[PDB]
Design a protein around this ligand. Structure first.
Ligand SMILES: *[C@@H]1O[C@H](CO[C@@H]2O[C@@H](C)[C@@H](O)[C@@H](O)[C@@H]2O)[C@@H](O[C@@H]2O[C@H](CO)[C@@H](O[C@@H]3O[C@H](CO[C@H]4O[C@H](CO)[C@@H](O)[C@H](O)[C@@H]4O)[C@@H](O)[C@H](O)[C@@H]3O)[C@H](O)[C@H]2NC(C)=O)[C@H](O)[C@H]1NC(C)=O
Lengths: 219, 218
C-alpha cells in the first residue's frame, strides 16, 4: 500500500497566522483518466470529514480562498493564508490513484496559548469502593499547555505500570488548555500491601516532575 | 442537495456481522461510485472499499475475505456488509463520495459508530473522590466522581444538577475489561466545601439509572 506521511502531527497556531501542512506519498501519485486524485479533508470534532481540496489544487464549493492546495508526484501541501477559528480541527490528505486508497495520519490544527502547568490532585480509594474489594487511585492533571504530558505512578518508591488507565480531554474551547485523568486500579488486598502512593507528572513547564502523593497509613 | 444517510447497528457481538445501509439523495448511483471508510483512534482513517457506478467493486486487501459492498440503484441504496467482527473492528463507519471531479456533488454519510462487544447492559458503580485526610487545603479545592463498570456508553455527569457548570472536566470513557469507566472533576473555592454541598449526578439511560453521590470529607 501507498503510505501517506503527513507532517506536522500537530500545528499550534494563533489566529491570523499562515499555516502549512505537508503530505508525502511513498510513490508517485499518477493520473487516472487524466485526473490526479489527491484530496484534503478537514474534520471537526463530532462531525464527518468535509472536502476542502480536490484534484490537488481545486477548491471545493463553499471553501474560501484562504485555503490552497499544491504539489505533484510525491510531495503535496495544504496552505491556509490566515487562520480563523472555524479552520481548527484535523486535516487529512487522501490519494485515490493507487488501490487500496489511503489517508495521511492527520494534522491537528490547534490554538496556541501561554504554557501552563497542570494542576495535579490525587485521590485515595473511597470506602464504598473498598467495601466491594476494589481499590482505584485517581489522579487529575488539569488545565495544562502544551498537550504533551507524561504521568508515572510510584508505589513505595517503585514505578508501577499495570492497572493504569489514562484519559485525555480535547482542547478547551475557552481557555485552550488540556486536561487528563490517570487511574490506578488494584485489589483491596494489594492496595493494603503498600503505604505510599505517588502520581508524577512530567511536563515541559518544569524540568522537575509535579509530584502528588499520600500515605495509606495517615488517611 | 447531496446527502448520505446511514442506518445500522451501534453494537455488534464478537464474530457476528455488521450491516449498514447508505441511502443516497441528490445524485444517482448509476453515475457515481460510493466508498466506505472507517475511523478509529488507533488507525486514523482507513479506506475499506468502493462500489463503482457500473457495479463492480474494489476492496482493501486486508478485508477481501469478509467484506462485501452492493447496491440497489433504483432505491438509491448502498449496502455495506462485513463478517466476523472483533474488538479491533470498533470504529465509526462512513459511506462517502471520494475521488472527486466536480465542485458540488460530493458528500459523506453522517457516520455509524460501531462497538463490537458481548458485554450486557450494566449500570455504573459511582464513587466519590474527596481529598485525602492529610491533603493540604489550597485556595481552590478539586473534587471528583468515579463512574465505574458500566455498559454501554454513554453516561452523563452533572454537578449539583445544572448548578455547577464552570470548572468541570468530564473525561472520555475507556474500556476496562468488558466495561467502561470514566471520571469527572470539579474545582470549587475551598471556603465553600464542605460547608456548601457538592453532589455529582450520574445518568445511564441504557440501564435507566440515575445516581446522585454527595462528596463528603473523609
Ligand atoms: C484484529 O484482531 C483480529 C482478531 O484478533 C482477536 O484478538 C487477538 C488478540 C486474538 O485473541 C485473536 O484470537 C482474536 O481473534 C486479528 O486476527 C487474528 O490475528 C492473530 C495473529 O496476530 C491470529 O493468531 C493466530 O491464531 C491461530 C488460530 O487459527 C485458528 O484456530 C482457532 C481455533 O480455536 C480459531 O480461533 C481461528 O479462527 C482459526 O480457526 C493460531 O494458529 C496462531 O498460532 C495464532 O495465534 C488469529 O488467527 C486471528 N484471529 C481471528 C479471530 O481472526 C487481527 O489480525 C487484528 N488486526 C489488527 C489490525 O491488529
Amino acid at each position: 500500500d501507498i503510505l501517506m506521511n503527513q507532517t506536522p502531527l500537530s500545528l499550534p497556531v494563533s489566529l491570523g497566522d499562515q499555516a502549512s501542512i505537508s503530505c508525502r506519498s511513498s510513490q508517485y501519485i499518477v493520473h487516472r483518466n487524466g485526473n490526479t486524485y489527491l484530496e484534503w479533508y478537514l474534520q471537526k470534532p463530532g462531525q464527518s470529514p468535509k472536502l476542502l481540496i480536490y484534484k490537488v489544487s481545486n477548491r471545493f464549493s463553499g471553501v474560501p480562498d484562504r485555503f490552497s492546495g499544491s504539489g505533484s508526484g510525491t510531495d503535496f501541501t495544504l496552505k491556509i493564508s490566515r487562520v480563523e477559528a472555524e479552520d481548527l480541527g484535523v486535516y487529512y490528505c487522501f490519494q485515490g490513484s493507487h488501490v487500496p486508497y489511503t489517508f495521511g495520519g492527520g494534522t491537528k490544527l490547534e490554538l496556541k496559548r501561554a504554557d501552563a502547568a497542570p494542576t495535579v490532585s490525587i485521590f485515595p480509594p473511597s470506602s464504598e469502593q473498598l467495601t466491594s474489594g476494589g481499590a482505584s487511585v485517581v489522579c487529575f492533571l488539569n488545565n495544562f499547555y502544551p498537550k504533551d504530558i507524561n504521568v508515572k505512578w510510584k508505589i513505595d518508591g517503585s514505578e508501577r505500570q499495570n492497572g493504569v488507565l489514562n484519559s485525555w480531554t480535547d482542547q478547551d474551547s475557552k481557555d485552550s488548555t488540556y486536561s487528563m485523568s490517570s487511574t490506578l486500579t488494584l485489589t483491596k488486598d494489594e492496595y493494603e500491601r503498600h503505604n505510599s502512593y505517588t502520581c508524577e507528572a512530567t511536563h515541559k513547564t518544569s524540568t522537575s516532575p509535579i509530584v502528588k502523593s499520600f500515605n495509606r497509613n495517615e488517611c | 442537495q447531496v446527502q448520505l444517510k446511514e442506518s445500522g447497528p451501534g453494537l455488534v457481538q464478537p464474530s457476528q456481522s455488521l450491516s449498514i445501509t447508505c441511502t443516497v439523495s441528490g445524485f444517482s448511483l448509476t453515475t457515481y461510485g460510493v466508498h466506505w471508510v472507517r475511523q478509529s483512534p488507533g488507525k486514523g482513517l482507513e479506506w475499506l472499499g468502493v462500489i463503482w457506478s457500473g457495479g463492480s467493486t474494489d476492496y482493501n486487501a486486508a478485508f477481501i475475505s469478509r467484506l462485501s459492498i452492493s447496491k440497489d440503484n433504483s432505491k438509491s441504496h448502498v449496502f455495506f456488509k462485513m463478517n466476523s467482527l472483533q474488538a479491533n473492528d470498533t470504529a465509526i463507519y462512513y459511506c462517502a463520495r471520494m475521488r472527486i471531479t466536480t465542485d458540488w456533488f460530493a458528500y459523506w454519510g453522517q457516520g455509524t459508530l460501531v462497538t463490537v462487544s458481548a458485554a450486557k447492559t450494566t449500570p455504573p458503580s459511582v464513587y466519590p473522590l474527596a481529598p485525602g485526610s492529610a491533603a493540604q487545603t489550597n485556595s481552590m479545592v478539586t473534587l471528583g466522581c468515579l463512574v465505574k463498570g458500566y455498559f454501554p456508553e454513554p453516561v452523563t455527569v452533572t454537578w449539583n444538577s445544572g448548578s455547577l457548570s464552570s470548572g468541570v472536566h468530564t473525561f472520555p470513557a475507556v474500556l476496562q475489561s468488558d466495561l467502561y469507566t470514566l471520571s469527572s472533576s470539579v474545582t470549587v473555592p475551598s471556603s465553600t466545601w464542605p460547608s456548601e454541598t457538592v453532589t455529582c449526578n450520574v445518568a445511564h439511560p441504557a440501564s435507566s439509572t440515575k445516581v446522585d453521590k454527595k462528596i463528603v470529607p473523609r
